[PDB]
Symmetry: D2
Subunit: 46 residues, 4 copies
Amino acid sequence: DEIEKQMDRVVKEMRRQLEMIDKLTTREIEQVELLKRIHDKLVVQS
Amino acid sequence: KDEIEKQMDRVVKEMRRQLEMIDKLTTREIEQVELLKRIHDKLVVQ
Amino acid sequence: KDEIEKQMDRVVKEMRRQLEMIDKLTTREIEQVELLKRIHDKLVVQST
Amino acid sequence: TTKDEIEKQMDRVVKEMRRQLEMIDKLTTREIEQVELLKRIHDKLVVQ
């Protein structure tokens, strides 16, 4: 079937893009942590 | 000095770009889920 | 066994709801980064 | 307000987005696990 071949291509795209979302979310959490280090460095300022 | 705040500004602009990428990529995922149900609907039609 | 199509239909509806939730939370995140940009602007008006 | 109180707003915002950011990450992993069952559905559908 050609619908079954299309479903396989789509399922494979969704996993690739979904891992990319997951990678990018992970990077965002580390950038939120850097903001906590930036905030912590702001009260140690004075 | 004000290298903390300039760094935070670089981080804030970074998170916007990457959170937009997450958002655009999630949006594409939802459109692929609906194509997936159109495939499911095309499978009962076939 | 046309229960795989019933399973596939159950999964696609599940993924759309959970994916819409991801999309709402990301959208909320962007509003908070801009709130963070307003905080950044208030910090330069303060030190300077 | 006071620079000591802007940091409190930034601190509340930073902790909020991290919690919501963890939630996005939780749902994305759950989504990847469903695409896997979606691939198992396709493979069980081609054997038919």
